[PDB]
């Protein structure tokens, strides 16, 4: 769909009023199927490894998140449609320049292709960027065709701060999701009993990311 109208008339006000935005049928059935095929090709060839945490301590990572992930730049062979999805995400964000809060977005992480392989695996309640590592917007694309949440679970439950209700996001096929990465949106991935795929990106605020890099580079 046209990036300008979607960004300015839907995504921007949605994020500024709620901090969460859902865009269903983002790319269409075809492109979604190609992205799913590429993700399953990554899975089949053993590209996924245990999802990690910002701060590792005595606990095993699988007690916190049960997904296995890999990182995609978008230009790798066999990942072309993932690159197209990433470029679409970037196009929307660029069309949101200077309208999402006070943030000045100039970059993002690579794409995290994540798989919860059923068996009740999930992600405990957590905040994506609690201590200001520069991430200001979390963007997720779901590509699970035939997903039935009432049986397979895997719902992303977000507890937006100050709201009388929480937001349940089913990992529906072709769904795109935006939400503030900071403490305003704690969230959990409820247990999944089927193979659940997602592709996540974290967009950086320029100043906060600069400060975070300064802190990291100085010890």
């Amino acid at each position: 769909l046209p990036a300008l109208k979607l960004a300015l008339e839907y995504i921007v006000p949605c994020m500024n009023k709620h901090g969460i935005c859902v865009v269903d049928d983002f790319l269409g059935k075809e492109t979604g199927q190609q992205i799913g095929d590429e993700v399953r090709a990554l899975h089949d060839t053993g590209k996924f490894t245990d999802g990690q945490l910002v701060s590792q301590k005595s606990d095993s990572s699988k007690d916190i998140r049960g997904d296995k992930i890999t990182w995609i730049e978008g230009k790798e062979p066999g990942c072309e449609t993932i690159g197209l999805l990433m470029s679409s995400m970037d196009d929307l964000i660029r069309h949101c320049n200077g309208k999402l809060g006070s943030y000045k977005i100039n970059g993002r992480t690579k794409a995290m292709v994540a798989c919860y392989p059923g068996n009740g695996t999930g992600y405990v309640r957590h905040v994506d960027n609690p201590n200001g590592d520069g991430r200001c917007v979390t963007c997720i694309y779901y590509l699970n065709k035939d997903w039935d949440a009432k049986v397979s679970g895997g719902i992303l439950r977000i507890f937006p701060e100050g709201k009388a209700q929480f937001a349940d996001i089913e990992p529906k096929f072709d769904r795109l999701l935006f939400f503030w990465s900071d403490r305003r949106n704690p969230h959990e991935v409820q247990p999944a009993y089927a193979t659940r795929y997602a592709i996540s990106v974290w967009y950086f605020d320029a100043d906060e990311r600069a400060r975070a890099k300064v802190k990291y580079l100085t010890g």
Binding site: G51, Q52, L53, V54, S55, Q56, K57, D59, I64, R65, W71, E73, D90, I93, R94, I105, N106, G107, R108, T109, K110, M112, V124, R125, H126, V127, D128, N129, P130, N131, D133, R135, R183, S200, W202, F204, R209, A212, K213, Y216, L217
Partner: peptide
């Protein structure tokens, strides 16, 4: 307690993708 023990890891030093 320390919420960073539960936050998803992203590369810190690295490069980052510039838009």
């Amino acid at each position: 307690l320390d919420l960073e023990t539960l936050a998803p890891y992203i590369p810190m030093d690295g490069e980052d993708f510039q838009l």
